[PDB]
């Protein structure tokens, strides 16, 4: 870690706020350094080529350390703060600002650091701490791993470094392109029907394993031969429809206890071409309210840039027959 | 007159073995001036029944209204704490550690919460819990409000309230034994008196006006006599308990007004005599919608772990160290 990270952390301390090295058991030979810009999220490919070009500075001929951006774990927070009407001078809009700062001040200080961790109980005491009028808060978290490629998990897998619950793992939705014509003079003569779809996990087996299955289809546009046939279990979360779509299929699988997640859309004869996205986001409920980082993973609150991962509900109180 | 004037009156003539006073008057009970009194040490003033609450009676000035020196209507917090710490950061035992967090959970209560018209917040106390070591990483909790009920048979004339809002089905008591008149045998033993099963009081989802039933069960088909009035509660709509004895027929005996925050029941509404029940006092648990629990009139949120240990479970969890290498 610090053996080489620190140096770098000297010649570049004006940008990078977090640097640590690690190996991949598997990508033998390769040493990577994750670095987080103090100034946001991803170092720029120019900022990256400069930093790599101090590798020559310190003479090493062997292929030498790949710099790269950190594997972020995000907390989708659903915050609720109840406050006293009397004791609150400015706008609700102000108050939010006042606390959404506190959250960040906790993250920067105690969390946004390698192998340091997020404790929901701590940041709530930060929230409480934001005004002299913030009587008490509560909070509900999710974990977000932002997936680089939707089509197949890495060679190795995707892991949260944390225990999730059953059926918990679920990506967002991405358009699948069937291939049929719609024949609609509204928008010409042909739209190419494309219905949303997601990738969810099902319940632990006898032995700790689930199945990573993929959202609703219309019989025809997925070819089934004995082997590859519709999944049947109802041990997962189906999604809102308006269409006659209820045929989910099975790729990869979740090892709940070892938290590893592998899937590969290929397991059903569907080329990347068929989906109009390239990136997705995987969510899942933690088991605990204390969540952890490990090799090159970093937990981070970047809220003016990932605002989708915080929501604040306030509850103004006076006196009082009622706060819900 | 004036409750405030009275509160003082006692924060003087007794201001010795008394910590706090709430002089409130109940709108259901005219001409009666009620005086809540915290013992400053324990829970009940003359649990010996007056020894004390009679001495204060013996203080008279003016008015046609009469004092009724009572002990405070206590709100309890059944906390299921789940603190987690770092194996290495810890030098003394889990045993010494518990005795360290509850030292804080107490510090919070007795400074901010254990007061009249004062309140409790889970988030705020879990800050105090977290603040007991160099680690101690974080903490979880799962709380319920508890109201201790003397005479399980029936609530007061005017119902019992929490001074807080609870959730649908949230309200449920601990279990108690109901002596069915009947008799059975096993294991070579004999009649074994009268068959007993564990029975209890639960609330149902609120109807379209904010109002569910307060029901009691299960039973046998059974040990309760059904009338035009007395009939098994009609439908699923709440929390049933383990029929390790197979039973299930519950009966309506009151209702919760969720908005008004009032709960009334009377076991006499079916026809069971208190004789058919082992108990006298029971516990009434509900879980709030409140991220803040409010005390109020004669109500008081207190934390007495020593004398009320049952209302706190701490499950610790040790954690492996991270990087020790550099």
Quick gist of this model?
The first copy, chain A, has helices spanning 2-11, 45-52, 92-111, 120-128, and strands spanning 16-23, 31-37, 66-68, 71-84, 118-119, 136-147, 170-171, 176-181, 192-195, 199-201, 212-214, 249-251, 253-255, 260-262, 280-283, 290-291, 297-299, 310-317. Chain A is α+β, with helices and mostly antiparallel strands and 324 residues long.
Short descriptors:
324 residues; GMP Synthetase, Chain A, domain 3; 28% strand; three-stranded mixed beta sheet; part of a larger assembly; globular; alpha+beta; 2 chains
Give your account of this protein's structure.
By secondary structure, chain A is an alpha+beta fold. Chain A folds into 2 domains: 1-69, GMP Synthetase, Chain A, domain 3; 70-324, no CATH class. Chain A contains 4 helices and 18 strands. The first copy, chain A, has helices at residues 2-11, 45-52, 92-111, 120-128; strands spanning 16-23, 31-37, 66-68, 71-84, 118-119, 136-147, 170-171, 176-181, 192-195, 199-201, 212-214, 249-251, 253-255, 260-262, 280-283, 290-291, 297-299, 310-317. In chain A, strands 4, 6, 7, 15, 17 and 18 form a 6-stranded mixed beta sheet that branches. In chain A, α3 crosses α4. The first copy, chain A, is globular, with a radius of gyration of 23 Å. The termini of chain A are far apart. At the A-B interface, β4, α4 and β6 of A face α3 and β6 of B. Chain A: It is found in: Virion. Chain A: Belongs to the T4likevirus baseplate wedge protein gp6 family. Chain A: It comes from Enterobacteria phage T4 (Bacteriophage T4). Chain A: Baseplate protein that is located next to the tail tube (inner baseplate). Involved in the tail assembly. The gp25-(gp6)2-gp7 module is involved in sheath contraction.
